[PDB]
Structure formats: structure tokens, C-alpha cells
Amino acid sequence: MAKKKGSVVIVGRINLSGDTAYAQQTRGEEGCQETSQTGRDKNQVEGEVQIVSTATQTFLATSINGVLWTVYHGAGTRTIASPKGPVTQMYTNVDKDLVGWQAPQGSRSLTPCTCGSSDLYLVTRHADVIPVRRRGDSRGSLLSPRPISYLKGSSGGPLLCPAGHAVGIFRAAVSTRGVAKAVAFIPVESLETTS
Numbered sequence: 711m712a713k714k715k716g717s718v719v720i721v722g723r724i725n726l727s728g729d730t731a732y733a734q735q736t737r738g739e740e741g742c743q744e745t746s747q748t749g750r751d752k753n754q755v756e757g758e759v760q761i762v763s764t765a766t767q768t769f770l771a772t773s774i775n776g777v778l779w780t781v782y783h784g785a786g787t788r789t790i791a792s793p794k795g796p797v798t799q800m801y802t803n804v805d806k807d808l809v810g811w812q813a814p815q816g817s818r819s820l821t822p823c824t825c826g827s828s829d830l831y832l833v834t835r836h837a838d839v840i841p842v843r844r845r846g847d848s849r850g851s852l853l854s855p856r857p858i859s860y861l862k863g864s865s866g867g868p869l870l871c872p873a874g875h876a877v878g879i880f881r882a883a884v885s886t887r888g889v890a891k892a893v894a895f896i897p898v899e900s901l902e903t904t905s
């Protein structure tokens with residue numbers, strides 16, 4: 711009676727600004743650990759897709775409509791570190807595997823897709839842009855299957871339409887013999903409802 715869980719910490723981003731997609735690290739392991747305990751993150755934030763970490767897990771978080779969204783199975787109910795201290799979740803929905811905080815100052819938000827397109831692109835934490843054919847409200851198939859190892863740590867990352875709109879938030883992978891054939895995601899409409 712007489713410990714607390716730490717904050718989620720932004721430790722990098724996936725840069726989608728130019729011709730090449732690439733990951734950038736903005737904070738190393740030691741600063742991440744310290745920032746998770748204090749909840750105080752003075753680092754400038756840029757971009758749409760953040761790489762985030764706890765003391766024990768790393769994954770992604772994506773800004774859509776002024777909210778930084780990620781997965782409950784990564785973040786739990788944790789605060790996120792910010793320049794003025796830990797920030798409490800604005801959205802929590804374990805039934806959707808979904809949490810969200812106010813988007814960080816300096817971030818850019820993706821626009822929710824209204825295209826109705828089924829030709830999607832999943833952005834991973836290694837800056838791979840993986841073609842995915844939409845197969846349902848919350849599922850899509852990989853055009854080129856690959857070991858689940860390549861998707862591990864990319865929950866909270868976006869599925870994008872051809873125009874660069876957000877279609878969904880990656881939450882789970884479907885595999886056979888360790889080979890990822892399909893993905894599950896929180897559809898942007900389910901976020902817009904929550905919103």
C-alpha cells in the first residue's frame with residue numbers, strides 16, 4: 711500500500727513526408743525508461759504515426775482527427791507522457807482493443823477515409839508499406855503474405871487508402887504456420903463513433 715504503472719512514451723515516428731517511408735528514433739532506451747516513470751516528455755513531436763513504448767512493450771500510435779489512437783493490449787489504461795506531465799486517456803474501449811489520447815502538439819492528423827476503397831496499405835514500425843485488400847468491416851488480406859514476425863510491434867499503426875486517408879487501426883494478425891495471411895483493424899468509422 712505505502713507502485714504506479716509508467717506512462718506510454720513516444721520514442722520515434724514513421725516518416726511518410728517524402729518519397730521514401732522510413733522510421734526515425736527520437737528517444738533511446740534510457741530516456742524512455744525515465745520518461746515513462748516521470749511522465750514528462752519535452753521532446754518535439756512530428757508526423758502522423760508515432761512509435762511508442764512502455765517499460766515492457768513497443769508498438770505504434772496514429773493521429774486521426776486530433777486523437778492519438780493505439781491498442782488497449784499495448785497501452786492498457788496508461789497515461790501518455792507529455793511536456794506538462796502524464797495525460798489521461800480520452801478514449802478507452804477494451805471491447806474494440808482501442809485507446810486514445812488528445813493528439814500531441816506538433817503532430818499531424820490523418821483524415822478519416824470516405825473513399826469506400828478496398829485497396830489499403832498497412833504501415834509498419836519498420837516503415838514497410840504493405841498492400842492489403844479489404845475483406846470486411848474489420849479485416850483485410852495481405853497481397854504478399856509474410857511471417858508474423860514482420861508485423862509484430864505494429865499494432866496501432868494505420869491502414870491507409872490510396873489517397874492517404876485513415877481507414878483503420880491495426881490490432882491483430884491472422885496466421886497459418888506463422889505466416890500472416892490477414893489482418894484485423896479498428897475501422898475509422900468505429901473511431902468516429904467513439905469520437
Ligand SMILES: COc1ccc2nc(C)c(O[C@@H]3C[C@H]4C(=O)N[C@]5(C(=O)NS(=O)(=O)C6(C)CC6)C[C@H]5/C=C\CCCCC[C@H](NC(=O)OC5CCC5)C(=O)N4C3)nc2c1
Binds near residue numbers: 770859880
Ligand atoms: C488485454 O486486453 C485486451 C483487449 C482486447 C484485445 N483484442 C485482441 C484482438 C488481442 O489480440 C492479441 C494481441 C494482439 C497482437 O499481437 N497485435 C499485433 C501486434 O503487433 N501487437 S504488438 O506486438 O505491437 C504488442 C503485443 C505490444 C502491443 C498486430 C500483431 C502482430 C503479430 C501477431 C503475433 C501473434 C499474435 C496473433 C494474434 N492474433 C489474433 O488474436 O487474431 C484474432 C483477432 C481475430 C482473430 C494477435 O494479433 N494479438 C493477440 N488482445 C486484446 C487484449
Ligand SMILES: [Zn+2]
Binds near residue numbers: 824871872873875876
Ligand atoms: Zn480515402
